[PDB]
Design a binder for these strands. Sequence first.
DNA 1: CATTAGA
DNA 2: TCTAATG
Length: 327
Amino acid sequence: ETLNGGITDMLTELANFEKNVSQAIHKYNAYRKAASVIAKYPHKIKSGAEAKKLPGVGTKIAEKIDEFLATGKLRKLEKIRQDDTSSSINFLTRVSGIGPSAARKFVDEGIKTLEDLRKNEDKLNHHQRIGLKYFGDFEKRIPREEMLQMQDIVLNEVKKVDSEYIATVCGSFRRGAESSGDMDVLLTHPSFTSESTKQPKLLHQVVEQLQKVHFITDTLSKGETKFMGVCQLPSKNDEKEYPHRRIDIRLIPKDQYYCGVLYFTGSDIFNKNMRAHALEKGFTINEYTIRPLGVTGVAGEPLPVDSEKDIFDYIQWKYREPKDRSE
DNA sequence: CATTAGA
DNA sequence: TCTAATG
Ligand code: NA
Ligand code: NA
């Protein structure tokens, strides 16, 4: 956690590189597992050999470990950090909609900069066009102060269309958090669950609403169960217009809400820990349900959940407020 | 690890 | 269809 830090850190650096710049999933996979193990290792790695003893720890990585242990650096590291082609990839990749594939392709063509980006908007798909379009706004955190206003808003329409709709803004936001990256709205309806063959309009209705009043400005992706968009707080009695924010709303089978809700709310560690627990308590949890465990090794049978509580109860735990769902 | 675009 | 990108 700190005794192994650099090693791991250099390692992930390395790893991450092969993966995006090059296309060496393998090596990329090497660094990672090695990075994973040294990470665990209960003592100060004093040399490559020492390290080497490890699982997934090769001779190549031992080597890098020594140079790094000896000199507070790595050449390949330095060489990479410098590398413009590499540097460029790392960067394009910031635009919502650009990934390693497209990033490398763009370089090869020569778009290494944001401007290049613009000159070449034709060479960009709608997602990417907006990614670039709200680039600034997109990299900006969301003050809870604004979250609250947004929330207030969605909840109002959600309701206005059909009073049946159940909406929850999950995420850190929910967990009390001061700021947030984007707003995640968990959505379900009673007339929709596991079986009842969809109802696409179910999502479509609210999107249309939201857009109706201008909270939604754009559509990244809109499918029958997941809408990826862009919203914005009405820029008041001008002077201060609001940044364009990422927004996601997913339709859900009422029968699997709180599981989902439980989950999306996290934290990533809370979940695990919670998950790790249900297992002892003779269970299994996952993004949609919770099933009793049968000693045959495994077992099915989705228990019925009416709220975050049921789930707790089941695994017989202390209801932990979203606030303390930290770990 | 599942959902959407797109080509 | 497969393959990318997002979460
Ligand atoms: Na990106
Ligand atoms: Na393949």
